[PDB]
Structure 1
């Protein structure tokens, strides 16, 4: 037996049902490409159930008594168990629509609505996009310029080198300022599509104007290929030029600044997983009547914000057993 919400159960990094969860996640992703948001969430939830199981699913009897495991997801697993392959999944994999939407949406700065628009307009390849530079934002141009490197999984060794240059720049700009690794790497992942950092300072307001100083420092060291600064939290969505022995690699890096009062909420929100956070927010609203986001936890009946010093505070306030980041891999 297993609880309904992903935020009520530990989901570890490595599990016993990777083939099955991957097939369900293909169907979820394809659903999102078609704007089918309900079906996306349903497949995502079913995949995350399999990730939380203690043993491999070898036979269909193992499905018994699991939440969020409807007829469709059951059917998928059934064909995988009996036939080694699911027809619907293979047809999605082979389809030009899926392949092209995956190609485009992978690009830095391209979401589903942009990818779909380009698909509808007859664009198929990365060369097709480069032939129409008037259709691209400067962010997307940068994403295309570095697409091979940005398609290469980011490694822990890369994270460690990046955290060192970001920590050095932050420390030189403002002694006492801190850098915290968030995103998937905080959850224990060995690889990622980017590196996520959250920056703050223990005195509220001392973080003002810190990010542009950090970026100047990084730029003057040759480490920045692309930067877009947005005054929501202050953030810079970047492409770093990471030196490596004999060469270099472009790597996506998100730098987020939060005032220390909001840091616990920001750390929780940015640590993920995306599904875990969606589930945590749904749980907070539906079960506790509170609205959770990356800035705070709001009681809409009382018009009050919860004061939290830590993630542990937020879990406790919501009536949830604490899950460390490595158990949030929903």
Structure 2
């Protein structure tokens, strides 16, 4: 038996069922593009199960008694096992709707609602968007300007170089302030679509006004192509950036999220920002459904008692929810 929730089972970075999970995730994504949130979560859960399996699925009899594997997800695997291809997945891959929604939603600053609006308005290509700049936010304009670089996977070596410049800027602005790599790279991934950093200081409140100082420094070194600062509204102070990463003989644009959290909230922010998206969705559903507690990136609240949990680490949070600790590299759900 394998547990129902992704937060109750280790999901490693690499697994034995990449072809099958990829097919299911194409169906998940396409459902999300159509606003079919239910079907999205269903395919995503089924994909996540395959990722946690210790062996490859070579016959359909191996699906027996697995959670989150309904009729539709089973048929997909079946056709792939029996014919090497699933017709519905290939139709989706070649569909103009899917290809366009993928193209648009991949652009920095574009979500599903925007992509779908643009689709319904007859926009199809990147050039179509560039011909209608009045329809674009400044963030989306920057996304388009750098789209080739921003669709090139970010590598671990890029992350290392970026963490150095961010640590130097942070260290110069405020001694004692820390930078923590989060997101997919903290989960052990070898590549990504951006780099995520969480910034704090051990004395609560010393992190006030730090991010703008970090950004000034980075800007002065020629490292920033685009920067949008947002103050917290509640909800963390953050900066959405495109860095200009020097490389031997050239350079590349890379997406970076810099998030500041007060150290009291840091374990929650780290947990939330480390992901995966599905893992965190599942952890929050678990906390609510199973334990009656509301988890987010700022805290763990008991709505009956009107209390907040005091957490020193991620381990404290897992412990409090009755879950065995999962290090970041087993959260790849």
**What TM-score do the two structures reach when normalised by structure 2?**
0.99
Aligned-pair CA distance for 1:154: 0.0
Aligned-pair CA distance for 1:196: 0.1
Aligned-pair CA distance for 1:215: 0.1
SS in 2 for 1:199: strand
Q: Distance between the aligned counterparts of 1:195 and 1:10, measured in 2?
A: 23
User: How many residues of Structure 1 are paired with residues of Structure 2 in the alignment?
Assistant: 330
Deviations 1:160-179 (A, max 9, x none): 00000000000000000000
2:251: which partner in 1? 248
Aligned-pair CA distance for 1:117: 0.2
Q: Does 1:237 align with 2:256?
A: no
SS in 2 for 1:260: coil
Aligned-pair CA distance for 1:309: 0.1
Deviations 1:235-264 (A, max 9, x none): 000000000000000000000000000000
Deviations 1:76-119 (A, max 9, x none): 00000000000000000000000000000000000000000000
Moved >4 Å (runs of 4+): none
SS in 2 for 1:48: helix
Q: Distance between the aligned counterparts of 1:47 and 1:293, measured in 2?
A: 24
Q: Distance between the aligned counterparts of 1:118 and 1:112, measured in 2?
A: 10
Q: Distance between the aligned counterparts of 1:71 and 1:298, measured in 2?
A: 37
Deviations 1:20-55 (A, max 9, x none): 000000000000000000000000000000000000
Aligned-pair CA distance for 1:139: 0.1
Deviations 1:148-203 (A, max 9, x none): 00000000000000000000000000000000000000000000000000000000
Q: Does 1:298 align with 2:301?
A: yes
Q: Distance between the aligned counterparts of 2:122 and 2:65, measured in 1?
A: 46
CA RMSD of aligned residues (A): 0.2
Structure 2: gaps (5+ residues)? none
Aligned-pair CA distance for 1:120: 0.3
Matches within 5 A, 1:257-276: 257-276=260-279
Aligned-pair CA distance for 1:122: 0.3
2:221: which partner in 1? 221
Q: Distance between the aligned counterparts of 1:132 and 1:269, measured in 2?
A: 36
SS in 1 for 2:264: helix
Aligned-pair CA distance for 1:207: 0.1
SS in 2 for 1:99: helix
Q: Distance between the aligned counterparts of 2:325 and 2:69, measured in 1?
A: 25
SS in 2 for 1:10: coil
Structure 1: gaps (5+ residues)? none
**What TM-score do the two structures reach when normalised by structure 1?**
1.00
Deviations 1:41-75 (A, max 9, x none): 00000000000000000000000110000000000
Aligned-pair CA distance for 1:136: 0.2
SS in 2 for 1:228: strand
SS in 2 for 1:104: helix
Aligned-pair CA distance for 1:314: 0.1
Q: Distance between the aligned counterparts of 1:261 and 1:303, measured in 2?
A: 18
